[PDB]
Write a protein that binds this ligand. Structure first.
Ligand code: 60I
Ligand code: DMA
Ligand code: MG
Ligand code: ZN
Lengths: 315, 404
């Protein structure tokens, strides 16, 4: 019967009666090994029996249970995962029981690539995304920036058209942590694939929302980057009130992000034949100097490049 | 005063949370408190800061690992060509010779990892995968002997890359696997080094990579995803190989990567509002020589003739003061454990930070003792530039393979 890899009564496969018929196949590392891992007895035992079932292509229930132990010893072994999926279909295994299994191993190793890809295959096979948004929200409740979890969330939402409640979920996570860049990315992902940003009421709503988040947390870079990202498509100089509204927030909510955004506005204004070109260029170069020498010295080479670029494009 | 991170004005670069605490600011403040303890240790102990790269300790750790690893490395049993690459590249950066017998042993092991239908697996008899294929080809090019080049079955490698190519331009990481930007970089890297690029192998690939550049300016693993340093390096490096860098908005990419250097720590974060990490010294800083080359090709007259567009000094100070393990090897940040992955990319990032080169201009910045200077690394392949020329020169003497 079943024996978990970490159960106290786990026995090696070489001591199991139902495995006495097959000879283990040792790993051939060569006569002069390199990057040779001195496997524990338990690991070496599972993988010598895995190599045996894989070589003879034994599509049996015992081989299927053996893949669970081989995965739990090294979840990045994509060869074991491939053979487990061959056995899932050959043996007609209950895929809801496999969904329960993949749920448990993702909870244990949420940053492994293979576990998330296996979950996607099961969801595709069953054509059932009904447990996904809730499961992913549980993983994100433990690590709200898990890249694989956000990727799986976007895949489920696009593949099964589950767009209706995601902006509400995004709003909930921005309340919990307005600095979570993965959630500002999810916000852009939902809006760009539903209403789009060409709708004026949506863009106005989004810029007004973002400016309020900037007023509450002026040094949160994600809100500044989202404001810039949604207005940079048409060009920052196409929004003439943006400049004066940022200059208004400068004396009490200033930051290197506000000053950098002013340079970005002036750069686009200079490229689009703005009024008072000499004045706009002098203001842009003055801010590049302030950023390079005092307010953002880590980016001194970037700001000096921007300053030289503005002078070159004007001359 | 010589060290940027120790100047009194550097205290002004600590996080300003605006009196609004969230999980992100709490974790960032925890790292900054720990990093400030490291920077202040010299003043506290009454010593002159002496930034020394512990070459001897790094070399001992690497030479042992090249031969044998404890069961603590069972999680890398499907990544053994990566271990070959990380260790050989770290040794190459440290100017440590690879004995001829050790080089032959690596060739023989990577031959066992090679699949009969092309590409390499994570260990003997494992199914092929683009990530260990990339690592094995880079490891064999670092060795650079006729024996090492002859290991690669070019005809089958080409057949294998075509079996992963998708109609939309993307590549699967392995058969029955998934797509991401790393696959396109893995394929472009091995295909250009071995001279197996046919006219249509990369049809649509540059456009698919461009769909991964998002609103932030950086690149995500797949379209729609958050910008991330590792995937952005893969995206831009693949486009440089294909000579299709103009497919991206290079100015939004430049602003994004320069923003990923941490004002206080000096190192790089992988994504906006995440923590500093030593391996992003290569993934993020490695983008600036790629962008310099891409912009220089377009005739950009405002480029520096001496420095990359990141604070090279601050990155070297973060790596030298915060990322070295006293027993040898490098790491993500203080308090983390050493590993061959962080040893490879902290040293690769340190070498990028030391060496600027563009056209006839060359300029080095070597923080700390002069012995800290590393061998140069090629920003596209992350192997020595001499090894890239040697491999490309060797495989250009062979025709591009035909189809069976
Ligand atoms: C370490 C480690 N610990 N464990 C338990 C495992 C399984 C490993 C391992 O084998 N790794 C780490 C992850 N990378 C993912 C990856 N593939 C790439 C291919 C080409 C270029 C870059 C690539 N990157 C890195 C990122 C772009 C994601 C930054 C592959 C190598
Ligand atoms: C898939 C992938 C590469 C995720 C990033 O890993 P992480 O969250 O552990 O690192 P970081 O916080 O630096 O993005
Ligand atoms: Mg896989
Ligand atoms: Zn790292």
């Amino acid at each position: 019967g079943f024996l978990s890899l970490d159960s106290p009564t786990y026995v090696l496969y070489r001591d199991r009666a139902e495995w006495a018929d097959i000879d283990p196949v040792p790993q051939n590392d060569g006569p002069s090994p390199v990057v040779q891992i001195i496997y524990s007895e338990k690991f070496r035992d599972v993988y010598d029996y895995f190599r045996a079932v894989l070589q003879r292509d034994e599509r049996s229930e015992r081989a299927f249970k053996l893949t669970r132990d081989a995965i739990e010893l090294n979840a990045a072994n994509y060869t074991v995962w491939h053979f487990r999926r061959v056995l899932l279909r050959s043996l007609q295994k209950d895929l809801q029981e496999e969904m329960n299994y993949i749920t448990a191993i993702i909870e244990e190793q949420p940053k492994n690539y293979q576990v998330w890809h296996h979950r996607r295959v099961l969801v595709e096979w069953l054509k059932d995304p009904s447990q996904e948004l809730e499961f992913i929200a549980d993983i994100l409740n433990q690590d709200a920036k898990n890249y694989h979890a956000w990727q799986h969330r976007q895949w489920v939402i696009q593949e099964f058209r589950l767009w209706d409640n995601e902006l509400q979920y995004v709003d909930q996570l921005l309340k919990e942590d307005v600095r979570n860049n993965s959630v500002w990315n999810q916000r852009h992902f939902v809006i760009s694939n539903t209403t789009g940003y060409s709708d004026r009421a949506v863009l106005e709503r989004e810029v007004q929302y973002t400016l309020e988040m900037i007023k509450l947390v002026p040094h949160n870079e994600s809100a500044w980057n989202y404001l810039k990202g949604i207005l940079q498509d048409r060009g920052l100089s196409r929004y003439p009130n943006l400049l004066n509204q940022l200059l208004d927030l400068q004396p009490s909510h200033s930051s290197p992000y506000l000053i950098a955004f002013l340079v970005d506005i002036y750069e686009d204004m200079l490229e689009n034949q703005c009024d008072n070109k000499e004045d706009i260029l002098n203001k842009a170069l003055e801010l590049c100097e302030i950023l390079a020498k005092e307010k953002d010295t880590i980016r001194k080479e970037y700001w000096r490049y921007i300053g030289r670029s503005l002078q070159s494009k004007h001359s | 005063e010589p060290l940027y991170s120790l100047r009194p004005e550097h205290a002004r670069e600590r996080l300003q949370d605006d009196s609004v605490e969230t999980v992100t600011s709490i974790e960032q403040a925890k790292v900054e408190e720990k990093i400030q303890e490291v920077f202040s240790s010299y003043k506290f102990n009454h010593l002159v800061p002496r930034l020394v790269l512990q070459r001897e300790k790094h070399f001992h750790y690497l030479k042992r690992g090249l031969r044998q690893l404890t069961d603590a490395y069972e999680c890398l049993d499907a990544s053994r060509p990566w271990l070959c690459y990380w260790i050989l590249h770290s040794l190459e950066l440290l100017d440590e010779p690879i004995p001829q017998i050790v080089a032959t042993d690596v060739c023989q092991f990577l031959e066992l990892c090679q699949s009969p239908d092309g590409g390499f697996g994570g260990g003997p008899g494992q199914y092929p995968h683009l990530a260990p294929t990339y690592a094995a080809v880079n490891a064999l090019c670092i060795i650079g002997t006729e024996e090492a080049y002859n290991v690669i079955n070019r005809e089958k490698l080409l057949q294998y890359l075509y079996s992963l190519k998708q109609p939309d331009g993307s590549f699967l990481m392995h058969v029955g696997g998934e797509v991401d930007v790393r696959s396109a970089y893995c394929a472009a890297s091995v295909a250009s080094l071995t001279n197996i690029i046919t006219p249509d192998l990369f049809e649509g690939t540059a456009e698919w990579i461009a769909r991964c550049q998002n609103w932030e300016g950086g690149i995500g693993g797949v379209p729609g995803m958050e910008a991330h340093g590792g995937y952005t390096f893969c995206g831009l490096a693949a486009l440089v190989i294909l000579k299709k860098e103009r497919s991206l908005n290079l100015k939004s990419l430049l602003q994004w990567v320069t923003s990923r250097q941490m004002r206080f720590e000096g190192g790089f974060q992988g994504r906006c509002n995440k923590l500093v990490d030593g391996c992003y010294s290569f993934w993020q800083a490695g983008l600036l020589p790629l962008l310099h080359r891409a912009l220089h090709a377009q005739g950009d007259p405002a480029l520096s003739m001496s420095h990359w567009m990141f604070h090279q000094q601050a990155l070297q100070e973060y790596i030298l003061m915060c990322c070295q393990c006293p027993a040898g090897g490098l790491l993500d940040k203080p308090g983390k454990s050493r590993d061959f992955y962080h040893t490879c990319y902290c040293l690769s990032g340190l070498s990028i930070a030391q060496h600027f080169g563009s056209g006839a201009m060359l300029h080095d910045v070597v923080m700390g003792v002069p012995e800290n200077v590393l061998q140069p690394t090629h920003p596209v392949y992350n192997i020595g530039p001499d090894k890239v020329i040697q491999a490309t020169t060797h495989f250009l003497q062979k025709p591009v393979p035909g189809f069976e």
